[PDB]
């Protein structure tokens, strides 16, 4: 079965061209005579431009194929203009005209000058790799993809040794070892079918690693989670039910080790955990299961009276990094409670506890979020004392942060 037809250009386009040139009152047989001649020349060239596509070993007819197909038929590749003498440009392609259907048809002559030129790409180089090693294709990134019998483990001993080396490197005794092991996790294609043992090693580790608050052990495990996530080959949402309560524990937990000093890292432990938490709510999303569940736990962490301030700071960070609208709809009705908590830490003399440090970190983070939440939905008018209607927390310094954001927008 082949219902192949002969499609020509419409004749009602050929009369428009003729009467817009000075040739009026053309007959239909005169006009049909134009549209079978030019539709043959389009068919003659597109069949002849398909010879250059095949010879160049491409499957896409580029714009230069018609330039050589025209030159082959002794017609100038020039499309915009036609030179009767032909001496200024003799069968020289000018690369066509960059024109569109949805174009503006008028531009300003200094708009084209002030735009940045595109980056010239890298030159052609010759790299060698292996398609086949004695018959077997390697999984390198240059390649696409009555007694019952004594059973064998589903991992090989090379794979089991690889798992042991990667896990003993990912506990961060040496930093270059970690970084390679993290890149190895980030791009091994065959890291599926080992992923249960990695997820179990992460989950089990954080839970017996918060019994004594060992910050590096945790910072290395969170980097292992981040290296597990950006791997494109492996299927993760079968294992995310173990991954998510591990990161929530890094963010919402108390620190058993020295309270101050590494709290700077503790903020990053809560910074790395809140980053991977909102990346996990970005992926793996179905209706009303993952993002709303962690949002509900973060909000009941917040509205809980008389919290640990480490847990308070971590939950504050976690609710803060959830995106544009989440701080637009959630952080709004709670400024008075935040201010009252800050006032209590300030009044009580107790300085040797961690309450004061927790309060300062929470207030700074909340004030930065409130700044763009404001820069985003209102003009920057009355930036001096109008914020005193919102208990005067960040005030003019918040206004200065908004001004810095406006300067960054101007630079963009």
């Amino acid at each position: 079965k082949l219902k192949l037809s002969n499609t020509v250009l419409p004749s009602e386009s050929m009369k428009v061209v003729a009467e817009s040139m000075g040739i009026a009152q053309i007959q239909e047989e005169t006009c049909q005579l134009l549209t079978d001649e030019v539709s043959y020349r389009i068919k003659e060239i597109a069949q002849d431009a398909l010879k250059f596509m095949h010879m160049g070993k491409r499957q896409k007819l580029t714009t230069s194929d018609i330039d050589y197909a025209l030159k082959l038929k002794n017609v100038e590749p020039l499309y915009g203009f036609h030179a009767q003498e032909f001496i200024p440009f003799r069968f020289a392609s000018g690369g066509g005209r960059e024109l569109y259907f949805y174009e503006e048809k008028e531009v300003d002559l200094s708009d084209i000058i002030n735009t940045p030129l595109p980056r010239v790409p890298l030159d052609v180089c010759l790299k060698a790799h292996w398609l086949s090693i004695e018959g077997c294709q390697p999984a390198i990134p240059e390649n696409p993809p009555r007694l019952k019998p004594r059973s064998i483990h589903e991992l090989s001993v090379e794979q089991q040794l690889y798992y042991k080396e990667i896990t003993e490197a990912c506990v961060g005794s040496c930093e270059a070892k970690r970084a390679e092991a993290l890149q190895s996790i980030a791009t091994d294609p065959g890291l599926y079918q080992m992923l249960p043992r990695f997820s179990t090693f992460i989950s089990e580790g954080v839970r017996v690693n918060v019994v004594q608050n060992n910050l590096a052990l945790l910072i290395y495990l969170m980097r292992m989670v981040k290296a597990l996530m950006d791997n494109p080959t492996l299927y993760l949402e079968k294992y995310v039910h173990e991954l998510i309560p591990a990161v929530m524990t890094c963010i919402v937990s108390r620190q058993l080790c020295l309270r101050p000093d590494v709290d700077n890292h503790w903020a990053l432990r809560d910074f790395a955990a809140r980053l991977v938490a909102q990346i996990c709510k970005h992926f793996s999303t179905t209706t009303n299961n993952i993002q709303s569940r962690i949002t509900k736990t973060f909000t009941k962490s917040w509205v809980d009276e008389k919290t640990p301030w480490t847990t308070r700071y971590g939950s504050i960070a976690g609710l803060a990094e959830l995106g544009h609208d989440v701080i637009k709809t959630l952080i709004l009705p709670r400024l008075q409670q935040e201010g009252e908590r800050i006032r209590s830490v300030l009044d009580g003399p107790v300085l040797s506890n961690i309450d004061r440090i927790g309060a300062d970190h929470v207030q700074s983070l909340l004030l930065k979020h409130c700044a763009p939440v404001l820069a985003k939905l209102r003009p920057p008018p009355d930036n001096q004392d109008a914020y005193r209607a919102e208990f005067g927390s960040l005030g003019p310094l918040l206004c200065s942060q908004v001004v810095k954001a406006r300067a960054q927008a101007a630079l963009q």
Partner: peptide, 25 residues
């Protein structure tokens, strides 16, 4: 549609919130 593979993934069928360790001791 309730036989879709996701329904049976244990993130959507497990109260994993209980695991998060708060103030453990």
């Amino acid at each position: 549609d309730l036989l879709a593979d996701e329904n049976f993934l244990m993130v959507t069928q497990l109260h994993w919130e209980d695991d998060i360790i708060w103030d453990g001791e």
